[PDB]
Structures are given as structure tokens and as C-alpha cells.
Paper text:
Aminoglycoside resistance is commonly conferred by enzymatic modification of drugs by aminoglycoside-modifying enzymes such as aminoglycoside nucleo­tidyltransferases (ANTs). Still, the S. enterica genome contains an aadA gene encoding an ANT enzyme. AadA catalyses the magnesium-dependent transfer of adenosine monophosphate from ATP to the two chemically dissimilar drugs streptomycin and spectinomycin. AadA consists of a nucleotidyltransferase domain and an α-helical bundle domain.
Trials to perform molecular replacement using search models with low sequence identity failed, and the structure was solved using SAD phasing with selenomethionine-substituted AadA crystals. The final model contains residues 3–262 and only lacks the first two N-terminal residues and the His tag. The N-terminal domain (residues 3–157) forms a nucleotidyltransferase fold according to the SCOP database and has a central five-stranded mixed β-sheet surrounded by six α-helices. In the AadA structure, several of the residues predicted to participate in ATP binding are involved in interactions with the C-terminal domain: Ser36 forms a hydrogen bond to Asp206, Ser46 hydrogen-bonds to the amino group of Lys43, and Asp47 and Asp49 form salt bridges with Lys205. Thus, in the conformation observed in the apo AadA structure the nucleotide-binding site is blocked by interdomain inter­actions.
Numbering used by the authors: 3 to 262
Write the structure that this text describes.
């Protein structure tokens, strides 16, 4: 399990930046995502988990967000510079597990304008953490420190069910769905996929797995989302809203209530 050469230099720069700002409290830095599974696409992001022992000073938070922003560019912006996603989490939140755990910090290109404004979102509870940790137990490269397998504990099956199904109650109505249709459709495919196959690294696999099992009506909707994810075509998701709403309902009806 190796790091693709093409991201080798960008990954090292973030690593040295993180180690620099974090200094002592740094426990581990894990690489995950398309870079280790599914293969890189022009639009893939480099994904890092940063495990730390104590919380960040506001100064450090500010330094990290600013400097990451600099080492990152929007996906499909430039060759030689890829979108970064960086999640900082307190060791004490994973070991022992707090449910849901808080994440200390998150960087991503969706924060670029907020960061330009000097707006830095604070620590908060994220059920996705449970998913994330479980995901990196399946596949990750330990860029700094111990391998995930040694460092992190599962995640009782019950909580995994809780964390996967949690987003389902986010979308009751059309208004819930209205501006998030692209994210929702892919998330629904991911949840269905993981619940069915038991496999938590879902981002590249889910759609391809599910599409053959979908009646054409819904497959058409999932297909557009995938194709947008792959970055080979972009869709106007506002016109696709009613087909997405239908997708949601059909998905809530058939998505497993338990692990197969």
C-alpha cells in the first residue's frame, strides 16, 4: 500500500506543516481516500486524519487553516495541486470512544471563502468520525506515527448502525433536500452500500455497486451524481430536484435497517 508519486510532494508539505504547528501534541497523521483506494482521478482530494493529544490554541487553529488553504486549491483547478481535506481529532475522543465524538477541526475547499474572511468553524460533534475511524481501519497509510490498526479501537456494531443511519432523519421533506441534492444522493448510495456490504470505505465504490440493482428511473439519478463526482460532467441539480426527492423516498424505503 503505497503513496502515489504524483501526490508525494503535496502530501509531504502538509505533513511538515502539520507537525510544525502541532509540535508536541501530534500523535499521528493518516492518509486515506482515493489516494489509497479506488485510484486517483483528476478531481480527487488528498485526505488526512490528524490525531492530537491536547486541543489547539486559537493561534494554531488560525495558522493551520490559513496554511492549509495555501497548500490547497479547488478540485480541478491546477495540475500539481490537489484539494486537501484535513480532520483534526482528539485522541481522548477515540480512545475511549465518545459517542458521537467531537472533531477538533476540519479543513476543506468548502471553507475557502469562510477562511478568507478569517471565519474558522469550532470543534463539534460528528457522527461521521465513527465512520471515518472505521474507514481508516480498513485502508490507510500512517504518514506519521502508528498504523491505525494499532492506534484505534472499533466501534461497537450498534454505534456503526447509528452513525450510518443518522443522516436519514435529516431529510424529511423537500425543503430538507432542496439545496443539498448532489451530496444527499451520493450519501444515500454510500449508506446503502456500507450497510449491505459491510464495507466502510464507500466513496468510489457505492454508486457502481448500486446502479445495477436500481430500476432505471432511479439509476438515472444516481448515474448523474456519480458522473459529477468523477468530474466528467456537471448537472443542474435544481431542475433534478423532483427526481432526487423520488430518489430519497425510494432509498429510505429500501435501505437496510441492519447489516447484511
Amino acid at each position: 500500500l503505497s503513496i502515489p508519486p504524483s501526490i508525494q510532494c503535496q502530501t509531504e508539505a502538509a505533513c511538515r506543516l502539520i507537525t510544525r504547528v502541532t509540535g508536541d501534541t501530534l500523535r499521528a497523521i493518516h492518509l486515506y481516500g482515493s489516494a489509497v483506494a479506488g485510484g486517483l482521478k483528476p478531481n480527487s482530494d488528498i485526505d488526512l486524519l490528524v490525531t492530537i493529544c491536547q486541543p489547539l490554541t486559537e493561534a494554531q487553529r488560525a495558522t493551520l487553516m490559513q496554511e492549509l488553504l495555501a497548500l490547497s486549491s479547488p478540485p480541478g483547478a491546477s495540475a500539481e495541486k490537489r484539494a486537501l481535506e484535513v480532520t483534526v481529532v482528539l485522541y481522548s475522543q477515540l480512545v475511549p470512544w465518545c459517542f458521537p465524538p467531537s472533531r477538533e477541526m476540519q479543513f476543506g475547499e468548502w471553507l475557502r471563502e469562510d477562511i478568507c474572511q478569517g471565519i474558522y468553524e469550532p470543534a463539534q460533534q460528528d457522527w461521521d468520525m465513527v465512520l471515518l475511524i472505521t474507514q481508516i481501519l480498513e485502508t490507510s497509510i500512517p504518514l506519521k506515527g502508528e498504523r491505525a490498526e494499532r492506534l484505534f479501537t472499533p466501534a461497537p456494531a450498534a454505534q456503526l448502525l447509528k452513525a450510518l443511519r443518522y443522516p436519514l432523519d435529516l431529510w424529511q421533506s423537500t425543503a430538507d433536500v432542496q439545496g443539498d441534492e448532489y451530496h444527499i444522493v451520493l450519501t444515500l448510495a454510500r449508506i446503502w452500500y456500507t450497510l449491505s456490504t459491510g464495507r466502510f470505505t464507500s466513496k468510489d465504490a457505492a454508486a457502481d455497486w448500486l446502479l445495477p440493482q436500481l430500476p432505471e428511473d432511479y439509476a438515472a439519478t444516481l448515474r448523474a451524481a456519480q458522473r459529477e463526482y468523477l468530474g466528467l460532467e456537471q448537472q443542474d441539480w435544481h431542475i433534478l430536484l423532483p427526481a432526487v426527492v423520488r430518489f430519497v423516498d425510494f432509498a429510505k424505503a429500501h435501505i437496510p435497517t441492519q447489516f447484511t
